[model samples]
Target: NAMKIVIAPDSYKESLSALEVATAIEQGFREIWPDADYLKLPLADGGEGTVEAMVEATAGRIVHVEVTGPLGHRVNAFYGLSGDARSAFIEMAAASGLEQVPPAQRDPLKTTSWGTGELIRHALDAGVEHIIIGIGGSATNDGGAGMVQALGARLRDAQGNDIAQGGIGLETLASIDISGLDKRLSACHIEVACDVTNPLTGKEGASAVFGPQKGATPEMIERLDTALTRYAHLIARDLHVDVLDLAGGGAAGGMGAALYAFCGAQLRRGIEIVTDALHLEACLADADLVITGEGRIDSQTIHGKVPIGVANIAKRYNKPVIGIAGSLTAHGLDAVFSVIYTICTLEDALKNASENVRMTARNVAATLKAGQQL
Candidate 1:
């Protein structure tokens, strides 16, 4: 009997994208099982490739706009709208990502989410009633003050002067003025795709967990955390929305908090949001075997990544599932996957992951063929 395989995987980061990964896997499997039924479903968990994937999935169009970058410079950013043009998809990384900052200049305190807000403004201008923003790969930690400002909310210091851009400026924040906020936002529905549940302030909050990755030092982290705390307090008092205690509010350096508090956005797991939009469960229903992959697999892979989400749905249909990765870090993945395969060591995988994934997929295909013969 020919097997029905679903090649559903997430992007391998800077390596192959999700669509490329799926195609590579499909190509490898076709070498041995040319007649086998295969379905290629490329996916993203609200990160870099999110806009592209969602737009492609919905047969939508992409609109480019010049907006403020993470470093407060001008950059080209884009958002996607569904075929019906009723919903718009935006990825924060398109404007406020670490990629926009050079490695030597990487500094969370200096990055801003102003570009993310600008994307939203553009979406609203396109007449989208529902906006889905993916909040990940951000370089800001100003409790979303930059985004608030972009959306017409004013962050003023004690002297009644406008605060400077970036997280460092949050330290001087005294009052928030939202009277001039775009009125169309009141009729808009916002959904924020957030991967983490970290709160807006505290040990597990934005600065403490994510700041170091964006080039924050020990002192910077403490200062930024304190600034975020103040921002949250003022937001609660002025906006009457308590985002400080919201789950996933720490995402995108507290941009999630601002979206929740000011825009009334609902934060949800990225994988959940993506899967629902892609109708993944229906795709898995007839799958006999599922193949999923990511850049790395470990304990973190279980935390709402594409692999785990695919596995859960595949299991419901009693389909065998396997995973391939650039590298493996933990041993407990076997509990979810029938087998796990790695292309190479993390370092080597980084060097040539695209070819490695194809080779690894061929090996898996060969093993499956042999098992059937036995």
Candidate 2:
């Protein structure tokens, strides 16, 4: 029987990257079907692999540009563009993500998304028709005011003084004047793929949910909440839009709101955006089985994780889905994926994660071969 195999998986998080996962899955395919043609697609949720995955998928070019990091320092960030000159990929994490911030210096009060905006400007310079921005793992909580600053919008006080960067400065924002948003965005399609459903204020908002993780004290969280609330009002008045009601409004500490309201970006699930970009539906057509997985599989897997996203589509066609992960806890896989079988890489006594990548792949291939027997 001649058939094709597609191995698509997200990163294993602290252990392996999306690239590593996909590569291992491909190795498994080679062993299971020596003559089968296979495709390896390492996926992301706009969180971690935002840069490498996009760059690889598009056969895109990478350009490093100097921009402000989370803590106001200048850092080099990279973006990618497809070979055809049609779509551009912008990973905000490359410029000013939370990981880039030093642990001792992690504070939303001083972080900004200014550099991310500059990356967008660089894309404009390249003359792209559409911009697919991955907004996750951010370090700032300025509600994307820093990005607006780069786009030529001014957040000023009643005295006509420009506000500073960070959440503290947002407290001073009395008005937003989009008089200078790069006119180029008006002619382009912007797809902002962020994974969160938090609103912009109150308990479920940015301050209550993400502030602590960014090193905010109780007082600081309260202050940040007040500041963002005021900033939201100013944005509403200037742009005549209600960004507060938007789902995922709190992602990247309000980057979602800023892009949706000012840049005309349509907010979407990160997996959905990437799947459409990869043409996953077309890829799955005529396939007998689909193999998709991620770093881990658990109860939370149902919440738009990359593997679940792929599995849902496979289920539509009633194809069986199998999973391979680094580890699994009891009950974690309950009622989530309709997995026919599960395999843990470490079960084979593989120690080094990187080395286990290849060895585990071989093991998975053998397991699939065994499963095919019955």
Candidate 3:
């Protein structure tokens, strides 16, 4: 008998990526039913592999470009196009990843989010209506000033001269003028995939918490924080938007603040954006079964996780959904997953992951076939 099975799961988070998980599952299932049609769509919750997952899920294409990077050097960056160019997906990390900057060159005072704005501009140029941007591993600590400027906002000092790039530029008393900002952005809906809750500048702020990693000393952090505070106030003064105590304003070295104020962006959990944009219900329509899971499945981690997103759609189609995880920490997964399996040793399971999931897939297939025997 031939059957159509869809495998979609989140990355095992450090153990295995989503694509590898899908590959292992397919390998095991193939052993049971050599002729069955297996469609693998790997996914993530707007984390590291988010762009890849979305591109794979939507059969989208990645657009590459070189942009002025955090260190004022040109770096190759990319964004994802999906939904027939109606929506675009981007990760700030791609343009200014921490690794993109050398350890000695990692100075928040010098880094800029200029590249991020250029990426967005490219998406807008492609005529996308919705932009999904993942903000996590950016190198800028400019309170989002660089990106906004790159988007055409003018920030000048009292002397009426354009300020230098980076957080240091924010130190000079600033005035913001958005009269020349891009017009296409007015029609765009920007979704910021933010998973942080830090304020723009304070003890838990962008500069204080992330500056060290970006090569900021204690004194530099103070300078960066004060500049960001000024940047935040002027945005309220000029743009008339007070992102001042807004949660997630500190994300991506304060780029989240500019995204919120200038782009009129809505910040939400990464998984939420990924799940909504994926159109999973469409993917499950013809599938006989759905398979999804992550590194660990427990009562606490179940909510908003990638598996739940898939399982919920499976329910709409009444599709049998199975979850395979590194471990099942809590009971009652049965209510959500038709059957759940777990692997024991979960550490550098990276090496053992393919075999573990493959064997688990074999057992699962065998169990279903056993039902046919009766």
Candidate 4:
């Protein structure tokens, strides 16, 4: 009997990349059965490694430029260009990612997406006719005002003065003066790859859903929710766009809303973006077993993470899917992916980080081999 293993996984977070995870899984297979065939499928959530994974899949060229960081500091942001170089893939988080901030200094309220805007400006300057923007993993909640500011749109108060950074500044956003926006952007098409469908503001909206993770206290969450609400009203009135209802409007600290209002970007599911970009549907028919994973296999992963996204597509073909991650609590993994087996470190595995990785990979391979036997 012929045997093959497909290794599709997301990163371990703070320690590895999707590529690294795939490699480790592949190694585990090699150690067990060197003659068996293995396929590696690395995954990302349009978060940190989005650009790198896309570039690797497309054999694209990468260009680096200095842009604004989350703290208004200069940071190097890279964009991937297709073989023709006329189309580009940009990850906004690369410029304004939350990972750059320390735990103690993590302040989503004060962070800005100016760096992301600057990177877009750089792409516009490059004369790319199409831009695919992946918006996730941000450190700001300014309702995308800081992004517009970087693109030459003035977010002013009723008195016609510019406001400061942070979600609290959204209240002062009187008018979106986009007349000064980069004219070159008009010649291109921009699509935002995001899975979030939350409105700009509400109980389950941007600030409320993502605020706690960004280090916001209850007061701060409420403040951000109020600011995003006001910002949405002003945006709808001025742009004649109901960004509040648009799905993924709350992505990347409201960067999705900004792109919709200013750049006319179409928000799409991140999996849809990646699938179309990588042509996964064509590969599925021949794929016997579909494997996908993330840093955690839980309730949310089944909704938008790459692993579940891939699994959902595989379900159409009725293929079995499994996941491997660093840690898995019983409740979180059991809910959404109840049909799929999940592998993670036990208590002892958590103490040593590197050892946990090897153990997880070995466990995943061992479990898959057992599945093959059954």
Best candidate, lDDT: 1
Per-residue lDDT of 96 in model 2: 74
Quote each prediction's TM-score. 0.82, 0.87, 0.84, 0.75
Q: List model 2 lDDT by residue over 290-335, tens digit each.
A: 6666655444653437777888777777666666655444222212
Rank list by lDDT:
1, 3, 2, 4
What is candidate 1's lDDT per residue for 1-374, written digit by digit as tens? 66789888887755677887888888888888889989888888876688887887778999998999988999998899988898899988888888888889887877889988899998998898888888777888877888878999989999999898899889999989999887788789888888788998899999999999988999999999998898899988999988888999888889888998888888988788888877889988988888887775454544437888888787777777888765444321232322233544575654356666777788888888898899
- Tens-digit lDDT string for candidate 4 (1-374): 44555666666554556776667656655666677667776666665677777776667778888888887788888888766666788887788878867788888778888888887888787778878888777888887788888889888899998987777677677887877988777677887887778877788788889888888899899888888888888888877778888777877777788898888887887667776666665566566665555664455543336776777777777666666655445412211221122343453333243444555556665766796799
Deviation of model 1 at 43, angstroms:
1.3
- Model 4 C-alpha RMSD vs. true structure (Å) is 5.3
- Lowest summed lDDT across 10 adjacent residues in model 1 is found at 330-339
- The global C-alpha lDDT for each of the candidates, from Candidate 1 onward, is 0.82, 0.76, 0.81, 0.72
Backbone clashes (count) for model 3: 0
Error of 2 at 333 (Å): 10
- Deviating ranges (above 4 Å) for candidate 1: 1-4, 103-109, 297-304, 328-374
lDDT of 4: 0.72
Give stretches of model 4 more than 4 Å off.
1-7, 25-39, 83-87, 102-109, 184-189, 212-223, 288-291, 295-304, 315-374
Highest-scoring model, TM-score: 2
lDDT of 3 by residue, 43-155 (tens): 77776778878887778899889998888789999999984888888988887668789877777887888888899989999999999999887888887777877889898
Clashing pairs for predicted structure model 2, backbone only: 12-295
